């Protein structure tokens, strides 16, 4: 089913590579085409091996080499894909998290569309490369139904996807009815609760049923009823248990079209899918806004930058 663009490089020589390398940053000035080159055609594993021969060759740390020679963007897009696969989740949370700031777009997408699964792996990775405690950052840093709707999610405890009940998907679509439109007010309770735990084959039949009974698609209720981050965390979840794919495929979107470019989401989304399913990501890219993301891509941006990210997609 899911597919990544970058696969592993077939004749991979991790030493030939740190050679390249070393000599497109040796001396004066800087070969970011041999670097974006080589690196966006190589696997995040491969990346770690080159790395690895980089500094028993030179005695030097490859990604702080890169990032005393690269400024901006593309700087932080080589560094992106020099972070560890298994770590680059729990480094954007952490950051997300952190100082004053918490930023909820980060954590609202990233929480929203990682399986359990996945969010198992990186609450592992977070507390073993950070000393603190996913959780309890999460936590320390939101409020509200916001809060406990993502700690849910981090308990990784989704239901599994047994055969589907067809009395428990009328019966929580009925509730989810009787909890938000003939609700004064909304039971938030509720709905974090059956979207937080029932499996994703359950909520894909509660969507449709909740659709018949009411007239409305659940995000349409989800806006009626709810403001803020937890509107949009909400949404998050329905678009992800509907489809990951077609969920980040509109984050992209979304980053590109408003008038700027959300860089760090550019960067974020590629990266981190690269080798998951951003192939099944700019097909439903292609579908919903009718433009390749490779178009997109091409034109909201500009550089090396715009070429690595461009080699990263691939497409026509
Ligand atoms: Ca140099
Ligand atoms: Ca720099
Ligand atoms: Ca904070
Ligand atoms: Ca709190
Ligand atoms: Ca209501
Ligand atoms: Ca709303
Ligand atoms: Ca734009």
Same mark, same amino acid.
């Given at each position: 089913? +899911?597919?990544?663009?970058?696969?592993?490089?077939?004749?991979?020589?991790?030493?030939?590579?740190?050679?390249?390398?070393?000599? !497109? %940053?040796?001396?004066?000035?800087?070969?970011?085409?041999?670097?974006?080159?080589? +690196?966006?055609?190589?696997?995040?594993?491969?990346?770690?091996?080159?790395?690895?021969?980089?500094?028993?060759?030179?005695?030097?740390? @490859?990604?702080?080499? =890169?990032?005393?020679?690269?400024?901006?963007?593309?700087?932080? @897009?080589?560094?992106?894909? %020099?972070?560890?696969?298994?770590?680059?989740?729990?480094?954007?949370?952490?950051?997300?998290?952190?100082? !004053?700031?918490?930023?909820?777009?980060?954590?609202?997408?990233?929480?929203?569309?990682?399986?359990?699964?996945?969010?198992?792996?990186?609450?592992?990775?977070?507390?073993?490369?950070?000393?603190?405690? #996913?959780?309890?950052?999460?936590?320390?840093?939101?409020?509200?139904?916001?809060?406990? =709707?993502?700690?849910? @999610?981090?308990?990784?405890?989704?239901?599994?996807?047994?055969?589907?009940?067809?009395?428990?998907?009328? #019966?929580?679509?009925?509730?989810?009815?009787?909890?938000?439109?003939?609700?004064?007010?909304?039971?938030?309770?509720?709905?974090?609760?059956?979207?937080?735990?029932?499996?994703?084959?359950?909520?894909?039949?509660?969507?449709?049923?909740? =659709?018949?009974? &009411?007239?409305?698609?659940?995000?349409?209720?989800?806006?009626?009823?709810?403001?803020?981050?937890?509107?949009?965390? #909400?949404?998050?979840?329905?678009? &992800?248990?509907? *489809?990951?794919?077609?969920?980040? !495929?509109?984050?992209?979107?979304?980053? %590109?079209?408003?008038?700027?470019?959300?860089?760090?989401?550019?960067?974020?989304?590629?990266? *981190?899918?690269?080798?998951?399913?951003?192939?099944?990501?700019?097909?439903?890219?292609?579908?919903?806004? !009718?433009?390749?993301?490779?178009? %997109?891509?091409?034109?909201?941006? &500009?550089?090396?930058?715009?070429?690595? +990210? +461009?080699? @990263?997609?691939?497409?026509?």
């Amino acid at each position: 089913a +899911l597919r990544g663009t970058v696969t592993d490089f077939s004749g991979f020589d991790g030493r030939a590579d740190a050679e390249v390398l070393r000599k !497109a %940053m040796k001396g004066l000035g800087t070969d970011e085409d041999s670097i974006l080159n080589l +690196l966006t055609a190589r696997s995040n594993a491969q990346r770690q091996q080159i790395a690895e021969e980089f500094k028993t060759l030179f005695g030097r740390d @490859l990604v702080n080499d =890169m990032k005393s020679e690269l400024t901006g963007k593309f700087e932080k @897009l080589i560094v992106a894909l %020099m972070k560890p696969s298994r770590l680059y989740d729990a480094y954007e949370l952490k950051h997300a998290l952190k100082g !004053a700031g918490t930023d909820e777009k980060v954590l609202t997408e990233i929480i929203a569309s990682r399986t359990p699964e996945e969010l198992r792996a990186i609450k592992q990775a977070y507390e073993e490369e950070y000393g603190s405690n #996913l959780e309890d950052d999460v936590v320390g840093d939101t409020s509200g139904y916001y809060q406990r =709707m993502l700690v849910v @999610l981090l308990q990784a405890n989704r239901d599994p996807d047994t055969a589907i009940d067809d009395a428990q998907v009328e #019966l929580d679509a009925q509730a989810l009815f009787q909890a938000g439109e003939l609700k004064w007010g909304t039971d938030e309770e509720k709905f974090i609760t059956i979207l937080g735990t029932r499996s994703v084959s359950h909520l894909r039949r509660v969507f449709d049923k909740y =659709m018949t009974i &009411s007239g409305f698609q659940i995000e349409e209720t989800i806006d009626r009823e709810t403001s803020g981050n937890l509107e949009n965390l #909400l949404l998050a979840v329905v678009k &992800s248990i509907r *489809s990951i794919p077609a969920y980040l !495929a509109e984050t992209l979107y979304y980053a %590109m079209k408003g008038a700027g470019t959300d860089d760090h989401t550019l960067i974020r989304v590629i990266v *981190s899918r690269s080798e998951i399913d951003l192939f099944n990501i700019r097909k439903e890219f292609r579908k919903n806004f !009718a433009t390749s993301l490779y178009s %997109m891509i091409k034109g909201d941006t &500009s550089g090396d930058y715009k070429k690595a +990210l +461009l080699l @990263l997609c691939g497409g026509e």
